[PDB]
Amino acid sequence: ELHLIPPLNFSMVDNGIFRSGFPDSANFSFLQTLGLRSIIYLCPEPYPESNLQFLKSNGIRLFQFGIEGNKEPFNIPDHKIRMALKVLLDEKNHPVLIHSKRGKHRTGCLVGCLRKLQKWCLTSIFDEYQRFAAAKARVSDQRFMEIFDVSSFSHIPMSFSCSI
């Protein structure tokens, strides 16, 4: 009866936007229910054959922006986050799942930058980031969001969003 398994740290971010860690075959029946158009994948590692067959069967486009893992206190790639954000803000790509390995750091930073574009105060952005990152919350991830300059994205409409 209970049989659907969302991927690790799965959540709905907004209308047409999801976040998680790395899906495996146990999660495919759940992800099929979302009717995804796109995945934004933030790790450099090649997509496993299992996941590639799932994308092909379901007509899902893979956007890969490979952000190299780093541990505190040693550099979040502004350019890769911004390339991912440009794809995320295009409603033609929705519904879209953002994922990394566990969906805490790279995924957390991309979602936090979306919230800054949505005009959330920093403490509200950090609270949501911390909910997922839990004991692995990094000051460096929040600093990245704190200094992220919204200028180049500020004209992009979000009529997709629940938040008008």
Ligand SMILES: O=P(O)(O)O[C@H]1[C@@H](OP(=O)(O)O)[C@H](OP(=O)(O)O)[C@@H](OP(=O)(O)OP(=O)(O)O)[C@H](OP(=O)(O)O)[C@H]1OP(=O)(O)O
């Ligand atoms: O605290 P560290 O510096 O030891 O981080 C560990 C690991 O934490 P753990 O050691 O408690 O298991 C992280 O997992 P969590 O903090 O998300 O639970 C993991 O991030 P991740 O989940 O892949 O990243 P997202 O998908 O969230 O972006 C990270 O991978 P990378 O930074 O991409 O290299 C690892 O670094 P290393 O062991 O050198 O490969």
